[PDB]
Design a protein around this ligand. Structure first.
Ligand SMILES: NC(=O)c1ccc[n+]([C@@H]2O[C@H](COP(=O)([O-])OP(=O)(O)OC[C@H]3O[C@@H](n4cnc5c(N)ncnc54)[C@H](O)[C@@H]3O)[C@@H](O)[C@H]2O)c1
Ligand SMILES: NC(=O)c1ccc[n+]([C@@H]2O[C@H](COP(=O)([O-])OP(=O)(O)OC[C@H]3O[C@@H](n4cnc5c(N)ncnc54)[C@H](O)[C@@H]3O)[C@@H](O)[C@H]2O)c1
Ligand SMILES: NC(=O)c1ccc[n+]([C@@H]2O[C@H](COP(=O)([O-])OP(=O)(O)OC[C@H]3O[C@@H](n4cnc5c(N)ncnc54)[C@H](O)[C@@H]3O)[C@@H](O)[C@H]2O)c1
Ligand SMILES: NC(=O)c1ccc[n+]([C@@H]2O[C@H](COP(=O)([O-])OP(=O)(O)OC[C@H]3O[C@@H](n4cnc5c(N)ncnc54)[C@H](O)[C@@H]3O)[C@@H](O)[C@H]2O)c1
Lengths: 336, 356, 336, 356
């Protein structure tokens, strides 16, 4: 039985000790400490060698990504790429710390756009009329000048032209994940999440890739250059296979919506994830999938009965960098 | 004596409010129980009750606009939109998260679609499949607190405070597999290029049951957009089927052209959005293509503080051009299972005669 | 096992049928239906006669309120008196439908002030600087001109003078509940909750009665006329005795904070309430009492183990009038 | 070709933002782990991380103001406030809900009070009693989902995801009863007029344990206001005691005079408010008596939509005069158990040398 006790600042500002004290502080601080433990368990499993029998089975996919003892799925909503958490995610992907990414369309396009032009701090209360008159788009307390999207149009159009040519003359069958890998290769910039993902053979799933600016551009482009097809069925097979042939799986899910369900549903195909951490601000009372507790997913078989999943009820912009500091960043040498 | 600065701060003079200002006043049960008067009184009750009254006004404005007669070239409209649905004076987009189809709000939505009262539906995959499954087997009431281990051991899946037996999905599998066979054959030999909306129309025709939202949608030529249709049980089934019968393709690009042109070629648009996520953004982003919706009502339980699109206020969408600057949008902060049936009672259901 | 099914508007707008369909609609609609059942159970118990043995025990208080078979505690936060729910609460109190009220100071003073001047509709987004320059105070999307409080000052000061005289020359020992009864008698207006409460011998508890405009006025008054004492200890005995000697109890609690805990803690003194409905927008994850589920209160003994309590997760301005329509208002004849 | 109006709506020209505008950028872990730099990066990370950075700035402004030297008549200050606490250049009010004392935030608050870093405390009754009880017996970690029936049968009480055995309250009873006896005797024969703040100071002196917030508060002459002190276990004990030893009176009127005069006679004020309810309103309303606080930070999980005072934004308080129009208040939307220790690390704990 563990006693409640907070960090005592009479000891000085010992930042590691302060963070490690969250576990005994209670409420969501305790859930943060539990999340640190769960992610560290994923990492320690990941670093365990594959036995001969385990290697045989894990090698049954067509994937170029090296085999590990724990396949980690990282999901995040689009707004987290608008935020500075883009840098946190890029770091994990750059160093091969996660194996599959799932995000919505905004979470793809805004990483690419940030290589062309920055996003700025604003305020939630700024009024839409005056912003629109100035072509300034609001994302929470952030601001994206519309010229950012004009730069995206100029950059993306020639790539769409080549994609259509490759589809029609080289037999390429595009899907969202294949498009995202191509966009990461084209942006060719080490600040980009998707640059590192394609370099490191980390697939990115986004079934509704048309829901955002990428969609706007595909739409406009289709009038001049018709017939681009983005198939979602092949991408379903691809994500599900990553779960089916994993030795173990962990889910780190920031936010809700399609990203959260799509990762969890893939893990149902193996009778459940072994480890799971949710960080989101949704609540269960509305019946939403976004707000469902991890234990709802246990009823479906998306999380194993013997797992010890954790949800932190908080804005991931506050929590996720601290979580990374106490988990992946402490094992950086093992990943290089 | 009392400190003068404190008196001055607490007892500061006030300006007179404009004469049009509306007083707060709740329904008086000394009148008895007249439910219409009770609902009308939400407007002057304050907080989200006042927002409910404002939502009633906005939806009624959409409906009144829709019923205004129109004079338009049916052939040009059809070519540019590639739709058989005739244009009206206000195109209404209705969006809802999947869980609302698990709930009894499925019946509320089915009524609106049955009577051709809305023009475009957007929902996530669960919101398609669970309407079909409900024609094969029911969903049951439960509790949020039921533990996952014991539910899983008994083959019961939890959706909030609702419960769906595994056997419901077995029935779905048996029903769907022969249809998927036909869709692959039609793709490979009859040139069909499947998209989510085309699939959803076919599934509605196949279920052939007037309790189904999607049966009525296809009968009335109301398209359904769901760009992540693989995220759910229908996806599971497509996945398993593809190892027995390879080849099915679902394209999302053509469906983007279809939804966006519905907005571009509208005379006026309204958005009624229940919940957040893809459904909310996809409707709003289509309306950016016309420089904004003319009317908008959100009913959702999300909050803005996390930066999410789900929790963004309507005024965020104004900054993008998704809602017109001159619009008067409304958000009700509430579970739609409580509010949406009341909203329909005071809006679409009062105009039943005009829709016939 | 009950099947999910919503109201079918092909039947027409049959408002009673529509409301009764919430029970099978799911999510918070189902909790609303359960709340209707729980409140109706309180009412049916209340209307049951007292046996000889039950009457003997219930009669052991000094209270002038007639005995019933279920003592109903109604609690509400101050903002609900700012809202139109003030009319809903006044109706229940006017017709002797509840037995004990608990509210915070705002929930007392704003009922009295509404007899002097109205509150108006506004918007949540109105900026404070321009409002303050005009002396307009904001309560959510409502507005109270500061002249309303100036009218309160003119009305309340002479009453405070008499209270101090009665304390010093007639031995009166004031407490919040005794002050609230006096203010209700003085306002002498059938639109007032507190007028009806004192007329019907329904006590009102508000231990922090100084936290609001009433406090402002007591504060200013104390410089000219010092020494008014408001004792909270006697009022603790008074509320607790109402629970201890009840045959049965029900709790209807709108909102959180002191109101919710104070009612629940009184009911711990009898080893728990028999019936309980919470309607509030708080969530449990922060460890708050406001956000605690009814089942937390069961661990303390504030709600009986055999009770079937209900929480509706919603703004009470939407839910409470509907709840009253389906419960107390249908039994109005029994209360007159 | 693409519809011209759609192109014009989506590709609208943008104005240039001011040169001072701050770019969004997260901490780069390629630098390694420097926790100070990590916390500093919250300012440019966005959403509530940015609000955290703004809260650090506001609290540091309060502290820097407090440390500015002052020249003031100690005798006049004392008479008008009836307090022995000397005036500083900024009077800081710290408020917290009771559950935060159940949590480990008790240690965070105790540190600030031990070092005389804040001037006025406001908490509800649980926030008083649980600090004292923690000197007699610990609180334990649990889970939110534990069922009430089984906990009650085993004599364990739940506070969120924390657990307190019944025996903790038995120990409290045994400790408190003789003190209540002395308080009644002092009231009836030594003229003591008890109020909540006076009682809390006495309980802190009696507990005589440096782990206690209230021990340090009374040693440093930091008053504690709690106008509903009867709403909790201390109330239970006063209630039971009164049938063995009648007569104890707790007056709230004198405590209103004491807290309000702390605000009226301040040179400058700051408010740091964790949570909502009475604690938030009582601090803010005291500051209306000076026409508003100069600095304010809220950390709470409430939302505005329900009209609640708990969920009101700082800008609502500006409309009342509780926060000055020229102030730059901040709200962080988060559980204070996560955020408050980080805030203290970056503010008060960096100024330890100046406070000694
Ligand atoms: N920047 C953007 O928001 C953006 C840009 C372009 C397109 N879109 C589109 O909007 C659609 C909806 O977006 P979505 O489903 O990715 O998520 P969303 O932003 O609607 O969020 C879904 C839920 O995730 C949780 N969440 C959100 N932000 C969080 C945070 N900071 N911390 C913790 N939890 C959080 C919340 O409970 C929220 O209700 C997507 O299709 C997307 O492409 C969004
Ligand atoms: N029954 C199911 O929930 C179900 C079934 C199969 C698949 N899925 C999959 O889960 C994914 C995510 O679902 P989604 O983004 O459609 O929604 P979601 O359930 O994740 O909800 C998104 C947001 O909408 C709002 N919302 C939800 N329920 C609400 C209510 N009752 N009233 C008002 N607002 C409400 C909430 O703020 C929530 O955070 C989808 O891809 C879907 O296909 C869900
Ligand atoms: N009109 C006012 O708000 C007002 C006026 C004067 C003084 N005050 C003072 O403010 C203090 C704090 O107020 P309080 O504790 O009464 O409550 P509060 O307004 O702080 O609300 C407490 C909690 O109750 C719940 N709640 C609030 N409004 C709700 C609604 N419409 N529906 C459902 N749940 C809701 C919320 O979870 C909230 O966090 C009191 O001491 C009071 O006297 C308030
Ligand atoms: N441990 C206890 O909670 C406890 C013990 C004994 C008595 N009580 C009694 O319960 C009553 C109500 O308590 P209260 O109004 O002080 O607070 P509360 O716990 O009811 O909280 C009020 C509001 O403050 C905010 N809040 C709560 N916890 C938070 C957190 N961790 N981080 C950020 N914000 C948070 C929330 O919005 C909440 O709705 C008091 O009279 C108290 O004495 C409580």
């Amino acid at each position: 039985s563990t006693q409640v006790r907070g960090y005592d600042f009479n000891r000085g500002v010992n930042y590691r000790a302060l963070l490690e004290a969250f576990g005994t502080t209670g409420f969501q601080a305790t859930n943060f400490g539990r999340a640190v433990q769960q992610v560290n368990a994923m990492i320690e499993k990941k670093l365990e060698p594959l036995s001969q029998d385990e290697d045989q089975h894990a090698d049954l996919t067509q994937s170029r990504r090296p085999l590990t003892s724990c396949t980690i799925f990282l999901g995040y909503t689009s707004n987290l790429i608008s935020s500075g958490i883009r840098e946190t995610i890029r770091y994990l992907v750059q160093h091969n710390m996660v194996d599959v990414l799932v995000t919505t369309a905004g979470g793809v396009e805004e990483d690419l756009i940030k290589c062309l032009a920055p996003t700025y701090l604003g305020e939630f209360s700024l009024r839409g009329k005056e912003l629109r008159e100035n072509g300034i788009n609001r994302i929470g307390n952030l601001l994206v000048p519309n010229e950012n999207y004009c730069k995206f149009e100029d950059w993306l159009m020639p790539i769409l032209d080549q994609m259509v040519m490759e589809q029609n003359t080289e037999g390429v069958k595009w899907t969202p994940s294949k498009m995202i890998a191509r966009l990461g290769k084209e942006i060719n910039n080490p600040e980009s999440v998707y640059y590192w993902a394609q370099k490191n053979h980390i697939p990115v799933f986004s079934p509704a890739l048309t829901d955002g600016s990428l969609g706007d551009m595909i739409f406009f482009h289709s009038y001049k250059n018709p017939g681009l097809v983005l198939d979602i069925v092949e991408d379903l097979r691809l994500i599900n296979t990553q779960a089916i042939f994993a030795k173990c799986t962990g889910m780190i899910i920031l936010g809700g919506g399609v990203v959260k369900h799509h990762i969890a549903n893939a893990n149902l195909m193996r009778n459940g994830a072994d480890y799971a951490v949710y960080i989101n601000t949704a609540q269960e009372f509305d019946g939403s999938d976004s707000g469902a507790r991890p234990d709802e997913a246990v009823s479906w078989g998306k999380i194993r009965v013997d797992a010890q999943p954790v949800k932190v009820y908080a804005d991931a912009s506050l929590v996720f960098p601290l979580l990374v500091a106490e988990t992946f960043a402490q094992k950086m040498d093992a990943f290089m």
